[PDB]
Design a protein around this ligand. Sequence first.
Ligand code: CLA
Ligand code: CLA
Ligand code: CLA
Ligand SMILES: CC(C)=CCC/C(C)=C/CC/C(C)=C/CC/C(C)=C/CC/C(C)=C/CC/C(C)=C/CC/C(C)=C\CC/C(C)=C/CC/C(C)=C/CC1=CC(=O)C(C)=C(C)C1=O
Ligand SMILES: CCCCCCCCCCCCCCCC(=O)OC[C@H](COP(=O)(O)OC[C@@H](O)CO)OC(=O)CCCCCCCCCCCCCCC
Ligand SMILES: CC1=C(\C=C/C(C)=C/C=C\C(C)=C\C=C/C=C(C)\C=C\C=C(C)\C=C\C2=C(C)CCCC2(C)C)C(C)(C)CCC1
Ligand SMILES: [Cl-]
Ligand SMILES: [Fe+3]
Lengths: 35, 42, 42, 341, 48, 39, 32, 31, 36, 33, 334, 105, 78, 41, 37, 52, 66
Amino acid sequence: MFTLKIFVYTTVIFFISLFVFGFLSNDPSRNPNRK
Amino acid sequence: GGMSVSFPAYLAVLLGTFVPVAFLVILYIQSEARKAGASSKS
Amino acid sequence: GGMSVSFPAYLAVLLGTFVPVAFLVILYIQSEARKAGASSKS
Amino acid sequence: RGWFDLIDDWLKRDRFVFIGWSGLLLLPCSYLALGGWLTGTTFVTSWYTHGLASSYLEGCNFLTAAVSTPANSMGHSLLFLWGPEAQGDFTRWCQIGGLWTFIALHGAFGLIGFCLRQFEIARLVGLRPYNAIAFSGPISVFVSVFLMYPLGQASWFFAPSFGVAAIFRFLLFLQGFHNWTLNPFHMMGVAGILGGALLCAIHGATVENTLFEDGDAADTFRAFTPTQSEETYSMVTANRFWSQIFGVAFSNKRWLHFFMLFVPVTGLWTSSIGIVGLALNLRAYDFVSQELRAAEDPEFETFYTKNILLNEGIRAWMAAQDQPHENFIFPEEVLPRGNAL
Amino acid sequence: LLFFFGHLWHGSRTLFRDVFAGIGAEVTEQVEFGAFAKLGDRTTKKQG
Amino acid sequence: MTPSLSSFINSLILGLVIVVIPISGALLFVSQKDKVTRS
Amino acid sequence: SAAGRDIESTGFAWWSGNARLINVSGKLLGAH
Amino acid sequence: MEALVYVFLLVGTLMVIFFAVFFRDPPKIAK
Amino acid sequence: TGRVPIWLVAFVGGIAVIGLLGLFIYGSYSGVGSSL
Amino acid sequence: DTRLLIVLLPVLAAASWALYNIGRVALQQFKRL
Amino acid sequence: ASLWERFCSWVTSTENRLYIGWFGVLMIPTLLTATSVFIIAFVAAPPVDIDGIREPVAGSLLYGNNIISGAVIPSSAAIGIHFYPIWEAASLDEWLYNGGCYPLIVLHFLLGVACYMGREWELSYRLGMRPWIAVAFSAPVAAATAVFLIYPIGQGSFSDGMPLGISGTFNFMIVFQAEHNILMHPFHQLGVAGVFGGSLFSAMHGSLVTSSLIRETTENESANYGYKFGQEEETYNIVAAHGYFGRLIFQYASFNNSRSLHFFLGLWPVVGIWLTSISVSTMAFNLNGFNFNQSVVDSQGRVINTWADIINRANLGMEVMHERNAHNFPLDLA
Amino acid sequence: FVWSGEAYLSYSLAALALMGFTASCYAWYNNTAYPSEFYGPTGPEASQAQAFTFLVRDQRLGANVASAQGPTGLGKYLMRSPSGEIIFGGETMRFWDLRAPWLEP
Amino acid sequence: STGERPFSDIITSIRYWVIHSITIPSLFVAGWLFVSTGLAYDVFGTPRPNEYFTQDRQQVPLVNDRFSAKQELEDLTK
Amino acid sequence: GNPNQSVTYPIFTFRWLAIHGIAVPTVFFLGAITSMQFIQR
Amino acid sequence: SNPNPNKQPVELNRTSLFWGLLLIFVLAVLFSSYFFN
Amino acid sequence: PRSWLTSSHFFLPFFLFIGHLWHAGRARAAAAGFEKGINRENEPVLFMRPLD
Amino acid sequence: ALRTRLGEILRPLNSEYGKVAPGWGTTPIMGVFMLLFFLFLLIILQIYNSSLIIENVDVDWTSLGN
Ligand code: CLA
Ligand code: CLA
Ligand code: CLA
Ligand SMILES: CC(C)=CCC/C(C)=C/CC/C(C)=C/CC/C(C)=C/CC/C(C)=C/CC/C(C)=C/CC/C(C)=C\CC/C(C)=C/CC/C(C)=C/CC1=CC(=O)C(C)=C(C)C1=O
Ligand SMILES: CCCCCCCCCCCCCCCC(=O)OC[C@H](COP(=O)(O)OC[C@@H](O)CO)OC(=O)CCCCCCCCCCCCCCC
Ligand SMILES: CC1=C(\C=C/C(C)=C/C=C\C(C)=C\C=C/C=C(C)\C=C\C=C(C)\C=C\C2=C(C)CCCC2(C)C)C(C)(C)CCC1
Ligand SMILES: [Cl-]
Ligand SMILES: [Fe+3]
């Protein structure tokens, strides 16, 4: 039952660190009209 | 005053009829609509 | 351990589904077969 | 020249408000129905009808005031001012309840006159008649809740009374006594009205959001003249946005605006079909598969089975106060209470 | 109740038969306000 | 002869007399003021 | 010198006519 | 016995949602 | 100048709307129909 | 009956001030057409 | 050119069939586990003790329950608003008895539509357009926050939230109007004027477009085939539909600016559902509706009933009969 | 970030939305920074004072106030928490985590 | 654009306020005397707040007959 | 800007009658509703 | 018994199929609970 | 007073979140350039490949 | 066009398509009969509704009794 808590918190942090380091990687240059 | 028959068999006959009956009417109407598309309005 | 429902209603739903579902698939396949007869092989 | 051709020239003339040949039916009957509500909500009591004080004259505000439904004692009567119930007297005809059939008959002959007006404008200016068709939803609610629902029931008493809080009885009246919510025609109607409120919100706030930069100012409301040939918004971008956000998207602006006609009207017409069946007590009250089971299992419970017990609370507590002509003298021990309150 | 709509559709259709495909190009100058005395009558071109 | 009957016939006169006034009031209002080039 | 108190001096209309103070820092300080 | 009907109707209307997104008639600009 | 401004005829007609609605909230806390 | 003409007396005072300022100009309209 | 920038330009790429942007890195795995638990617990969930009074409610398709009766039942009231995931249970079926499926769906669904709302911003940035379709989706997201999260925050347990089912929503509405009087609340009053008003203006604006189309089509074929997609010109006379509706009411009651007309379509239902979503959340902290019970009294002091009392006799009858053995004390949460 | 005037407002509206939602749940749950003698009793402790004032009254009528045998089979007055604490029974078991200065003695 | 005198060139005109800076009060005052001289209770049948009950009638009044409701409502008040 | 000095215009139009059907009952009833709430029981 | 001139073909695109396949299914989603009772 | 202070502090900070969604949208659309609408000379959708 | 023995004896019935009466025709004769039929329909509606109770007409179920 603890092994699910190790497995969920792997997955929740994985999509959160894709979220935080995704928007830190120059998001207002992803528009049209040259970058 | 009654005749105890198998109650799923109303679905075995009517879906056993109307699913392959509708398969042939699907194939026939498109076969004549392809003839009408090719002969007329070519 | 059981739920006493209306036994003709299996025919009311499944023929109520598969008769108008088969009506639209009859009309759609002949509409594209008329397009295929007119655009191609004219 | 002519004589009948003269009156067609004057009545169909261009003015500020338009009369038309429908205005001989609309403009009196809309005036005495909209004004007949406003003079019975202001002055006329309901004390000899329901035992309820409901007017602004005797201490009610805009919510809790109404022209109430006439009586159970009259019973489907048309209740004319010159009629056999209230002969000649205006003060008795207000006290019997005859203003309700003054409004609901002038309302039923005013909505004829407004839908004949939408035929008469679109024929004269040369349009298509798709506004009298979209108004047939609002006709079919007034003709089926205010007229065809009480005519099947017992009297005019069980009709909706024209008021803000008197409607709020009628929503809870059809919950306790009819299980209206479980009626699948009404659930066709909720997805027609909340679908029409979606389509007004999601189309109005995407052509204010995918629009062409036509002007040079910061606000965009000034960048449109009515008689421009070009499109004021981008259809290809709004198709591109909803194809990737939602998955499906319209490709036809002409089919898009018909879908904003069909979703509210064929939602409003389907719930009108159910409340015609609610006049006859042909209601969708209970699931008989689950009432046999819950009687044959005293631990089977669902939110449907909890919804039935809430209806017997409504129908047993309100009945001494809602229908006082019946004289329901239920003691405090026989009405269904729960536990501790 | 359902036949009340289809009469109201067919009465809409048998009068408005020529605009069933859509309105023409004659509509734009006969609609704008105060142009004509009688609405929908091009013989009443008020003027001067 | 019944008072419920004679109140209906008196309603037909009082329905006529009050609502001949928009019949004539839409007839005086056109023979004094009309369109210029029409029917 | 003085700037921005109209429709076609900034682009914003009167109902947005509180947002002519974005590039105007002196009036914005007296606005706060 | 009848829950097979509700699971068939709910999955069977969830396939029409799947087929209308990915197998749709592709809107192409009037060339 | 023989003219009233348009914003003035909506101003003194605007106070009376607040004035009539001000008496309708006061009258719900007084008199008949105010639970007193 | 006697309180009905207390209600309609400001209405009769309303139309009397209305037919003081308009009765020259409302005679112009009915004589024009 | 980097090992991350080649991934970072795939997530923010508009070439995919569905946009899979940086808000879609959160809403795709959260909604897909709010779908996979909703579909399974609608079919085959065991009965759930919702009230904490050790009487379970059976709301899944295995246990009877045709789909206008089945629901993913809310959590136990003994649990409350306590965080109840799977790993804080002794076993997985002990987690199912207390109704653990309801916070696992509704915290992932609410976090999924909050990142649907950012994803609706995000494609309006990469496509180069005005971005406020996220604002119009903030009216259903707040209304899905009001019945699912804020009403369990104010009223204590997660059992007071809306059940994920069709007959559960009708049970949620009757219990709400027993204890909070939403029908006589002036912000729900505005929301049904933005729901009827939004349904009016859909049937009004959608009518006047389709009644004033210029005929780029034949007679026998369909009317919609006359609008070639992606064309430059307008398909309907705005000047004729304005001249229609300027004859219907009067001339200056109708927008012949079609941008101010279409903004009024985006303002009347969206502000109305913003005021409904406030009202349920302000009634969550028990700022109820209007209470004109027993207001009209005569000179002797005898109570005269008004129309708010006959609502109250309905409101009292669904007050004594909801939660029929969950109360032990005479006042409801007082 | 975006470096503009409309941007720096938008960072601060999301921060003030976070503080305004937090200040609501201070006013609804806390009774130490928002004391009960001034702001009134909170949402939980009104529901727990009702269970306390009927625990008193039926004890003053001579009942053993534990072993209540409440109507659903659970505790009427005194009950067991899910973590195993002795709490008030009834509907008020959802507010079992109440710390209030008139019952914490 | 219709041929008659425009709306906002009427409201701004000085004859318009010279004619009814008085008759907008004179309808407001005539509405005031309709509900204060006891006429609004009488011609619409609304009871006065001391005329709800009666020393002979402590119960609520409700109509029972349909055709003789003129004879009943006469014997239901006083 | 200036008043309409000499242009002819009808005064008793149908827009005059259409307003006064909804305005003259309004200013009668407002003022009747204003007098209802000084009424003490 | 001449050839008829008034005959005309019927069209149905893929959008109209997917609405009709959605409508007939959802009315069977809605009304199955009431037919089964 | 708790029932006013909590109810009005859903009314203010929910709306204060809505204007954040208005202004995080508008500031990144004004700094990019398309705050007055889509440029008609080059809209970015017409220079993209279609979906399928 | 096929002409049969039955289509030849029904020929003058389907003959005068669009052969109207000029001007106003029998329209004031028609508007009297439309008015009298509507006047007939308000009578029997009020007889059914007991707003037009006439002598020896009882609209009870006991009318067809013994
Ligand atoms: C999370 C929010 C949510 C969702 C998804 C639904 C969904 C639904 N409601 Mg509901 N409702 C909600 C909140 C919600 N409601 C709230 C807050 C209230 C007020 C208290 C109500 C009050 C309410 C009433 C009173 C009624 C409904 C009805 C309905 C159904 C049809 C809706 C319709 O015609 O509207 C318009 C719909 C659209 C514009 C889009 C279609 C959306 C589809 C139908 C949603 C399907 C959801 C379903 C779970 C499938 C998900 C698939 C997924 C698992 C892959 C549908 C099942 C009606 C009903 O009973 O029908 C069964 C009905 O009568 N609802
Ligand atoms: C600290 C908060 C804050 C600040 C500084 C701003 C600042 C600004 N906003 Mg913004 N906004 C905010 C919060 C804020 N906003 C919130 C909370 C919302 C969500 C509701 C919005 C939604 C919003 C929109 C939709 C728009 C702006 C716009 C603007 C700009 C001009 C404002 C204007 O002209 O209004 C002038 C003021 C009015 C017209 C009056 C409005 C009155 C409202 C409708 C009623 C308020 C009810 C209130 C609770 C109670 C009133 C009592 C009543 C009895 C009178 C300016 C930069 C505009 C913009 O983009 O410009 C760049 C714009 O279009 N704002
Ligand atoms: C010797 C003379 C004679 C006699 C004794 C009768 C006897 C009768 N006629 Mg009759 N009739 C006669 C000559 C006669 N007819 C002639 C010469 C004509 C002209 C051809 C007619 C034409 C005629 C018609 C057209 C009707 C009768 C009807 C009747 C019956 C009335 C009792 C009844 O059940 O009505 C009950 C019916 C009504 C009172 C009709 C009321 C309908 C209202 C006006 C409109 C309702 C629909 C409307 C659209 C409103 C919808 C809104 C909704 C929500 C409510 C009765 C059997 C009626 C009948 O048979 O109905 C059963 C009927 O409809 N008669
Ligand atoms: C395991 C499971 C699944 C369990 C769940 C069980 C469960 C809850 C089952 C119930 C499910 C269910 C479907 C119930 C339905 C209830 C019921 C009886 C429905 C009957 C259907 C009904 C009302 C028929 C009558 C007709 C009618 C009124 C239909 C209403 C239509 C409707 C509801 C919705 C359509 C509205 C809608 C979603 C519009 C979106 C439009 C949109 C975004 C278009 C895209 C788009 C937008 C633009 O703006 C532009 C510019 C372009 C260009 C563009 O393209
Ligand atoms: C996780 C990331 C987000 C993914 C979201 C996925 C959701 C996809 C939803 C697709 C629905 C498509 C429905 C077919 C309909 C369809 O695909 O029609 C296709 C149609 C295409 O329009 P066009 O522009 O091509 O029109 C041109 C033709 O009509 C010309 O004749 O789109 C619409 O009409 C608007 C769609 C409205 C929205 C659809 C209704 C939504 C309700 C869905 C019912 C749910 C039931 C649930 C029961 C279990
Ligand atoms: C039935 C009757 C009659 C009569 C009728 C009439 C004539 C009526 C009228 C009426 C009128 C003529 C009026 C009334 C009323 C009105 C009103 C009551 C108004 C107004 C108010 C309001 C509207 C409110 C509020 C507000 C304001 C102030 C503004 C802003 C908004 C609001 C809403 C807030 C007759 C003779 C047939 C006979 C029998 C009896
Ligand atoms: Cl309790
Ligand atoms: Fe449109």
